[PDB]
Ligand binder design. Structure first.
Ligand SMILES: CCc1cnn2c(NCc3ccc[n+](O)c3)cc(N3CCCC[C@H]3CCO)nc12
Lengths: 275, 287
């Protein structure tokens, strides 16, 4: 099962089992917007796209963004009949929690309020964050989509079997795949696929089935439906061209691949879902 | 609320810990209280981390979170109660109350707890005797996960100058960009020695005093003992060049195989440092 090498600090198979059980304990519903019957999937795509932009401005990690997306989608699936006017508050509160979890120096509440441009106050965000955390039962430690890409890349590029914890993958392959994942995640249909299979499918579209299998342990039967779902998204990414690694002020250049970026993806999402 | 707040045990990494009792059950609990009215940024990062970790981290040698209660501008973490912590036990007792067999069973349990954490991709980053809770049956549990972090594989750069100074690993003192689960193993070696000697192994006053106490006993590290050590942010050629003191003289009452374990726990080079899993297979624990 384990694509991982032998580990000194743990059993490889056990570490990999623990990770797969997590995926099953954290449950996602591609149909959760049927509980909010007057909301459209485009509303979620705009909200998440907006959160990526906030992330890029505050040099937040991709991990912080994907944590917020998971909290958003799992919180909404616990609730019913949420009015479209509260999505910004739920989104920004999700990101507030995600930032306090993942960031060393997270932005202050005043900045999360500032980006909402009047709509959401600090008090509204403090109220909402508690509402979210109690609804989720404080289950705030998922393996995100991007956490799976981090580990697949490490396995692909592993040189030192004594340094499996020290990252040793190239930066441009990582951000190219993350760009495809950032596009897919704007479509709520993505939630039908486990987050490890989404990571694996986006890697396969930039790779081979030889590599996908090597880094992930999945077989073709496992990712087939996801891979096929993901094709219009891959195609659109290929035709628009991939983005170059950015430098971020105050971010080490060997750490810059971990910073969430943002392009005009709602145009790509239209193009993609056309097909 | 539904608790007779017997008393205040003390203060954690965050909040205040109280001993209390349930009225309905009569059961003894610990209460870590947060004042949400005094928190400009809402629930503290440390609290969100501890709650989220301990919801999914369950093991005989890890303290149990029983409930999280939100009543007013107050948030209460309800924990199983334990009667002693290792710091207060060691400050209240003779050496005879910490025999060689109880040190062995305490250390074994600590490694099982830490090993479970590392396999669940968690680093405590604050292992010290005050955070080690002991019951009357002979169990020891890790507590206070407010300074802990779930790590990724592979891991990124995280907060620096973590871990209480006395139990802090030298790769953190030399300002290394990446630290791993090995920092938790340094602390354990420091606690192991402290249990046998009844006093702290490295009682430093500063980061540089801390680093000199370590060098005095283990020797000043070189590219030969610790490859890359010279390329570390806070390394200086200006450092004195002490040499290894014999461990037989620090911990004479400790058996041969146990002095081998302590030497392996307290390796300078975090890459050459034993893991919790390997440590549990050590001959020390097979008589
Ligand atoms: C997790 C909550 C908990 C449950 N029991 N317990 C104990 N029990 C032992 C003990 C010690 C001294 C007096 N009394 O009455 C009992 C201590 C303790 N702590 C140690 C001191 C600073 C706070 C806190 C740090 C580590 O959680 N926290 C807890």
């Amino acid at each position: 099962g384990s694509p991982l090498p032998v580990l000194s600090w743990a059993n490889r198979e056990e570490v990999w089992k623990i990770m797969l059980n997590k995926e099953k304990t954290y449950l996602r519903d591609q149909h959760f917007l049927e509980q909010h019957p007057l909301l459209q999937p485009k509303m979620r795509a705009i909200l998440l796209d907006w959160l990526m932009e906030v992330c890029e401005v505050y040099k937040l990690h991709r991990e912080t963004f994907y944590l917020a997306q998971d909290f958003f989608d799992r919180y909404m699936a616990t609730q019913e009949n949420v009015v479209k006017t509260l999505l910004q508050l739920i989104g920004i509160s999700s990101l507030f929690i995600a930032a306090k979890l993942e960031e060393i120096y997270p932005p202050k509440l005043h900045q999360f309020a500032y980006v909402t441009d009047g709509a959401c106050s600090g008090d509204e965000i403090l109220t909402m964050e508690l509402m979210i955390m109690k609804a989720l039962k404080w289950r705030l430690s998922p393996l995100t989509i991007v956490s799976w890409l981090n580990v697949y890349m490490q396995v692909a590029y592993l040189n030192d079997l004594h340094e499996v914890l020290l990252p040793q993958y190239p930066q441009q392959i990582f951000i190219q795949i993350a760009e495809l994942l950032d596009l897919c995640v704007l479509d709520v249909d993505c939630l039908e696929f486990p987050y490890g299979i989404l990571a694996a499918s986006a890697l396969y579209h930039f790779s081979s089935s030889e590599l996908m299998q090597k880094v992930s342990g999945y077989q073709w039967c496992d990712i087939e439906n996801c891979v096929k779902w993901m094709v219009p998204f891959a195609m659109v990414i290929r035709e628009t061209g991939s983005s170059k690694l950015k430098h971020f002020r105050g971010v080490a250049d060997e750490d810059a691949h971990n910073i969430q970026t943002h392009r005009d993806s709602l145009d790509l999402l239209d193009k993609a879902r056309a097909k | 609320d539904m608790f007779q707040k017997v008393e205040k045990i003390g203060e954690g990494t965050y909040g205040v810990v109280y001993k209390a009792k349930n009225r309905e059950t009569g059961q003894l609990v610990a209460l870590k209280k947060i004042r949400l009215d005094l928190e400009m940024e809402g629930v503290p990062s440390t609290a969100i981390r501890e709650i989220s970790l301990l919801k999914e981290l369950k093991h005989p040698n890890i303290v149990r979170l029983l409930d999280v209660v939100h009543n007013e501008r107050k948030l209460y973490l309800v924990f199983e109660f334990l009667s002693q912590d290792l710091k207060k036990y060691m400050d209240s007792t003779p050496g005879s109350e910490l025999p060689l067999h109880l040190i062995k069973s305490y250390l074994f349990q600590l490694l099982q707890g830490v090993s479970f954490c590392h396999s669940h991709r968690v680093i405590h980053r604050d292992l010290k005797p005050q955070n080690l809770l002991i019951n009357e049956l002979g169990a020891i549990k890790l507590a206070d996960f407010g300074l802990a972090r779930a790590f990724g594989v592979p891991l990124r750069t995280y907060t620096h100058e973590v871990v209480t100074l006395w139990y802090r690993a030298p790769e953190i003192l030399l300002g290394s960009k990446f630290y791993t689960t090995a920092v938790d193993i340094w602390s354990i070696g420091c606690i192991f020695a402290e249990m046998v000697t009844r006093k702290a192994l490295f009682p430093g006053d500063s980061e540089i005093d801390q680093l000199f106490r370590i060098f005095r006993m283990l020797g000043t590290p070189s590219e030969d003992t610790w490859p890359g050590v010279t390329q570390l942010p806070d390394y200086k050629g200006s450092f004195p060049k002490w040499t290894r003191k014999g461990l037989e003289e620090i911990v004479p009452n400790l058996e041969p195989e146990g002095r081998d374990l302590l030497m392996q726990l307290l390796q300078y080079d975090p890459s050459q440092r034993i893991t919790a899993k390997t440590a549990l297979a050590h001959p020390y624990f097979s008589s």
